[PDB]
Design an enzyme around this catalytic site. Structure first.
Site, PDB file in Angstrom:
ATOM      1  N   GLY A   1     128.905 -46.882  30.109  1.00 53.36           N
ATOM      2  CA  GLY A   1     129.802 -46.219  30.422  1.00 53.36           C
ATOM      3  C   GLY A   1     129.631 -44.566  30.474  1.00 53.36           C
ATOM      4  O   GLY A   1     128.387 -44.104  29.458  1.00 53.36           O
ATOM      5  N   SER A   2     130.139 -44.028  31.484  1.00 50.55           N
ATOM      6  CA  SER A   2     129.616 -42.483  31.956  1.00 50.55           C
ATOM      7  C   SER A   2     128.414 -42.159  31.671  1.00 50.55           C
ATOM      8  O   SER A   2     127.322 -42.184  31.778  1.00 50.55           O
ATOM      9  CB  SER A   2     130.399 -41.796  31.776  1.00 50.55           C
ATOM     10  N   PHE A   3     128.278 -41.901  30.100  1.00 50.69           N
ATOM     11  CA  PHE A   3     127.787 -40.939  29.530  1.00 50.69           C
ATOM     12  C   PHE A   3     126.429 -41.819  29.179  1.00 50.69           C
ATOM     13  O   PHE A   3     125.693 -41.410  29.513  1.00 50.69           O
ATOM     14  CB  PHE A   3     128.081 -41.185  28.086  1.00 50.69           C
TER      15      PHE A   3
ATOM     16  N   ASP B   1     140.590 -36.756  24.533  1.00 59.98           N
ATOM     17  CA  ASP B   1     140.558 -37.620  25.060  1.00 59.98           C
ATOM     18  C   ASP B   1     140.879 -38.829  23.942  1.00 59.98           C
ATOM     19  O   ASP B   1     140.390 -39.906  23.908  1.00 59.98           O
ATOM     20  CB  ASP B   1     139.426 -38.121  25.594  1.00 59.98           C
TER      21      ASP B   1
ATOM     22  N   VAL C   1     124.910 -45.990  26.899  1.00 63.73           N
ATOM     23  CA  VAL C   1     124.710 -46.854  26.618  1.00 63.73           C
ATOM     24  C   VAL C   1     124.899 -47.092  25.494  1.00 63.73           C
ATOM     25  O   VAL C   1     124.361 -45.540  24.138  1.00 63.73           O
ATOM     26  CB  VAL C   1     123.366 -48.071  27.250  1.00 63.73           C
TER      27      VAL C   1
END
Ligand SMILES: O=C(Nc1ccccn1)[C@H]1CCN(C(=O)COc2ccccc2F)C1
Ligand SMILES: [Cl-]
EC number: 2.7.11.26
Length: 350
Positions: A30-32, A146, A34
């Site tokens: 996801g974004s960032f 978040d 693994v």
């Protein structure tokens, strides 16, 4: 199959340690980047490894924040190191963290799918532990930005909760403006929807309020694909904000006329046998006016959590409740007088 790195410990002095691990699975990216799971070779203990691209201008803001944190309700950075993969000519930061098996998100939805609600005792435990973690980080002037169920880790056996994903987290400084595009969809505070950049740490409290309600209702309270769709669901519940309130959220008064609806009597929002102190707590977190919302510390000391301060309280499986009262002066600096509520008589016994 065994990888061996030289990693810097998360807290404590710069004393590089040889760390070997194996059984390297993957568990989402996801974004960032693994996130792997592995087993430390000596101790057999499980870790999660968050691997992200390292920017060559500045050092990583998440890392810097993780090193300055030590709290019973926040994932422990065990080690951090650097690596790559193939030719690349690009560097990765690897955050080694204590593996925690579940999340509030996953649990919340197991109960939802099997058309049941989580026992209120677990709601109390999880919510209290969150507010402690918020209280701690807010005390450094750090906002998470978040808060959402997916970022609340759980050990189901111990009932221990740990806040994670500090990728959006930032030291908020009054006077300095911040991006209004941060928090996840359902847990966004009205001031963020209205695109304010003068927001405080109270956005985390709004977010937390949304988690509480969701655990009570068994589904998100303020859903919707658009900012507009969400603001409707909010207005449905809280009623239409007064000209004053809109001025407090985002002063820049973005320029929309909202439909005029009365507040849905908060008690008529939840299932019939819903504890009224739980409902009270909700409404003191989900306030339009950012300043009118409880602080994390004030919420920890709300009547809803009284059952956790009972000396007899145990987990339904019989084991003791986890650490709830071991406050530091740091953690209490928000408002030290509250210690008289937060730390109950039975915890002061010698
Ligand atoms: O992620 C986990 N634990 C964890 C994470 C970070 C630090 C410590 N423990 C466990 C808890 C439940 N898990 C999961 O939800 C499965 O893994 C993921 C799937 C999709 C996106 C992201 C994911 F992390 C795996
Ligand atoms: Cl050395």
């Amino acid at each position: 199959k065994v990888t061996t790195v030289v990693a810097t410990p998360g807290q404590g002095p710069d004393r590089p340690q040889e760390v070997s691990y194996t059984d390297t699975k993957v568990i989402g990216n996801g974004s960032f980047g693994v996130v792997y799971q592995a087993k430390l070779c000596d101790s057999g203990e499980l870790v999660a490894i968050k691997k992200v691209l390292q920017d060559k201008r500045f050092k990583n803001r998440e890392l810097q924040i993780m090193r300055k944190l030590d709290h019973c309700n926040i994932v422990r950075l065990r080690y951090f190191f650097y690596s790559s993969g193939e030719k690349k000519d690009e560097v990765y930061l690897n955050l080694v963290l204590d593996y925690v098996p579940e999340t509030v998100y996953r649990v919340a939805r197991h109960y939802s799918r099997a058309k049941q609600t989580l026992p209120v005792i677990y709601v109390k435990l999880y919510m209290y532990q969150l507010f402690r973690s918020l209280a701690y980080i807010h005390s450094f002037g750090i906002c998470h930005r978040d808060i959402k169920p997916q970022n609340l880790l759980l050990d189901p056996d111990t009932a221990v909760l740990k806040l994670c994903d500090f990728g959006s987290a930032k030291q908020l400084v009054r006077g300095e403006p911040n991006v209004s595009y941060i928090c996840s969809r359902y847990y966004r505070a009205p001031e963020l929807i209205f695109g304010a950049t003068d927001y405080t740490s109270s956005i985390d409290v709004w977010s937390a309020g949304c988690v509480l309600a969701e655990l009570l209702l068994g589904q998100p309270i303020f859903p919707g694909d658009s900012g507009v769709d969400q603001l409707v669901e909010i207005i449905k519940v809280l009623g239409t904000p007064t000209r004053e309130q809109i001025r407090e959220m985002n002063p820049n008064y973005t320029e929309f006329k909202f439909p005029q609806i009365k507040a849905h009597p908060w008690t008529k929002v939840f299932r019939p046998r819903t504890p009224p102190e739980a409902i009270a707590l909700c409404s003191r977190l989900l306030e339009y006016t950012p300043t009118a919302r409880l602080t994390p510390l004030e919420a920890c000391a709300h009547s809803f959590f009284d059952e956790l301060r009972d000396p007899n309280v145990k987990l339904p499986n019989g084991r003791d409740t986890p650490a709830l009262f071991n406050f530091t002066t740091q953690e209490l600096s928000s408002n030290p007088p509250l210690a008289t509520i937060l730390i109950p008589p039975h915890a002061r016994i010698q």
